[PDB]
Amino acid sequence: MRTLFFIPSMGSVRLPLIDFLVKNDIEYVILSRRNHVAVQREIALDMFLEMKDYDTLAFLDEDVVPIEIDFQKVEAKFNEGYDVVCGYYYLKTLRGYSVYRKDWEKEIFDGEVNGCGLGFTFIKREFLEKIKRPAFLAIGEDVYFFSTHKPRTYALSSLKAYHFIDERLALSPDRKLILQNDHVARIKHHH
Amino acid sequence: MRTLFFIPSMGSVRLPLIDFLVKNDIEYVILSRRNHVAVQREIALDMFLEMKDYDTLAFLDEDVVPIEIDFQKVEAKFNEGYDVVCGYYYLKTLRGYSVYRKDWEKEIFDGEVNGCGLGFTFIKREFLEKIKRPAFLAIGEDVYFFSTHKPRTYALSSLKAYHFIDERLALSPDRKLILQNDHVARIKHHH
Ligand code: NI
Ligand code: NI
Fold first, then answer.
1. Which of A39, A78, B56, B150 has the smallest number of CB atoms closer than 10 Å to its CB?
2. DSSP SS3 for B126
3. How far does the CA of residue A52 sit from the closest CA of chain B (Å)?
4. Which fold has domain B2-191?
5. Which residues of chain A have a CB within 8 Å of the CB of B189?
């Protein structure tokens, strides 16, 4: 499985996300600011669909920094017939976690869900090639996407991320505040 | 010649600089926020001196985005016995260009200068291994560095950069405002 990350930005990327991108050899498109995030997500879908080497479109909000991604567990869920695999981070709205059934979840679990906020979310090509386009419309384009297109959706507890508030302080998946203030290096020849 | 870029940041990097970093296969350390830029520059010097595979410490401010770098012209100047090679961008203070003799220069030229603002600046190891440490102290650590350590310093007109004001709008080296609002991609498999 080959994944292309699309990161909606406001024109910059915080260091902790740069570090994740470098350390994990991630392939991505960081989207410059547009009128609204829904417009960026539609652009992402358009670009993704043309880029046939990529099997999975991963949306990652610029303030969401994965702790670990078990890509084989994500791939396993798609193979089993899920359309969308959701990861967990705590919302900056303080309303709960980034996945929902009847409401934003209060606790992390592995299970089928109704949707998520599109901030840490893997979507398979097969599903996206079938959906009516344009696909994201803005409540948000997140509830719209799920309510309208009804993907078979699974939340993995093994997908966890920090949700950064500023460049250094983040909400951790254990609902604590953490601080990450390290430098970020891309060095190929420190022998 | 192998160059390690040190980029003092406030915890994020604007897209246009990410694009420069990716497109040009740059090796770097982006420095997280500290008390003051002088502290970041000293940390940079300490790290650089230990990393013996790197011949040149390049400082690049996070809001400075090179247009072109002729690395062979930089290397040529070091071979000729310069210690520091300075590039040009227009200051956001609007006072002139980033290099000075008696004052900030009003026009771009190839020639020996007294110093620059340390925002687009290549410094050779030989010089840095000789200087009294600690080396940067904050007027700024830029005038201090040059006034105190008196490197043999050359400004190359072939080193030009944009000086970004926000994430998209920049002062160009021709003293005009330009806008860069493209997405930034790192994609290895668009076949
Ligand atoms: Ni090497
Ligand atoms: Ni390939």
1. B150
2. helix
3. 7
4. Spore Coat Polysaccharide Biosynthesis Protein SpsA; Chain A (3.90.550)
5. 2, 27, 53-54
